[PDB]
Amino acid sequence: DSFVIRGDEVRQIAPGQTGKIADYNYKLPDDFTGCVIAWNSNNLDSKVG
Amino acid sequence: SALGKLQDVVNQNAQALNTLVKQLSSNFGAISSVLNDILARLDPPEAEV
């Protein structure tokens, strides 16, 4: 599952988290198995304007 | 005290039932002993615990 989020929202891509994108964008189950991968993409996914 | 043996059996059974009912009032280290209070106060990830 690939998406782009904020820097502070990377804690919410986890089982059992309370948050905004956890509730209305992407929800993980309590018994979720797997790995969450996050890396900074300021050089590619950002523009000066 | 002529009929103590039967009264003893009745008292023991009633006391065991009273203890079993009374044990529901104990929280056993949880925040509350009432299931409805936990389900209405906490989210399912910590309410599960």
Swiss-Prot record, chain A:
Reported effect, N43K: In strain: Omicron/BA.1, Omicron/BA.2, Omicron/BA.2.12.1, Omicron/BA.2.75, Omicron/BA.4, Omicron/BA.5, Omicron/BQ.1.1, Omicron/XBB.1.5, Omicron/EG.5.1
Documented effect of changing K20N: In strain: Beta/B.1.351, Omicron/BA.1, Omicron/BA.2, Omicron/BA.2.12.1, Omicron/BA.2.75, Omicron/BA.4, Omicron/BA.5, Omicron/BQ.1.1, Omicron/XBB.1.5, Omicron/EG.5.1; May enhance affinity to human ACE2 receptor
Highest rank taxon of the organism: Viruses
Effect of K20T: In strain: Gamma/P.1
Region (Integrin-binding motif): 6-8
Effect of G49S: In strain: Omicron/BA.1, Omicron/BA.2.75, Omicron/XBB.1.5, Omicron/EG.5.1
Task performed by this protein: Attaches the virion to the cell membrane by interacting with host receptor, initiating the infection. The major receptor is host ACE2. When S2/S2' has been cleaved, binding to the receptor triggers direct fusion at the cell membrane. When S2/S2' has not been cleaved, binding to the receptor results in internalization of the virus by endocytosis using host TFRC and GRM2 and leading to fusion of the virion membrane with the host endosomal membrane. Alternatively, may use NRP1/NRP2 and integrin as entry receptors.
Subunit field text: Binds to host ACE2. RBD also interacts with the N-linked glycan on 'Asn-90' of ACE2. Cleavage of S generates a polybasic C-terminal sequence on S1 that binds to host Neuropilin-1 (NRP1) and Neuropilin-2 (NRP2) receptors. Interacts with host integrin alpha-5/beta-1 (ITGA5:ITGB1) and with ACE2 in complex with integrin alpha-5/beta-1 (ITGA5:ITGB1). May interact via cytoplasmic c-terminus with M protein. May interact (via N-terminus) with host bilirubin and biliverdin, thereby preventing antibody binding to the SARS-CoV-2 spike NTD via an allosteric mechanism.
Name this protein carries in UniProt: Spike protein S1
Organism in which the protein naturally occurs: Severe acute respiratory syndrome coronavirus 2
Gene (UniProt): S
Parent sequence residues shown: 398 to 446 of 1273
Curated annotation (Swiss-Prot), chain B:
Stretches assigned to coiled coil: 7-49
Result for mutant: N27K: In strain: Omicron/BA.1, Omicron/BA.2, Omicron/BA.2.12.1, Omicron/BA.2.75, Omicron/BA.4, Omicron/BA.5, Omicron/BQ.1.1, Omicron/XBB.1.5, Omicron/EG.5.1
General function of this protein: Subunit of the fusion protein that is processed upon entry into the host cell. Mediates fusion of the virion and cellular membranes by functioning as a class I viral fusion protein. Contains a viral fusion peptide that is unmasked after S2 cleavage. This cleavage can occur at the cell membrane by host TMPRSS2 or during endocytosis by host CSTL. In either case, this triggers an extensive and irreversible conformational change that leads to fusion of the viral envelope with the cellular cytoplasmic membrane, releasing viral genomic RNA into the host cell cytoplasm.
Protein name: Spike protein S2'
Phylogenetic placement of the source organism: Viruses, Riboviria, Orthornavirae, Pisuviricota, Pisoniviricetes
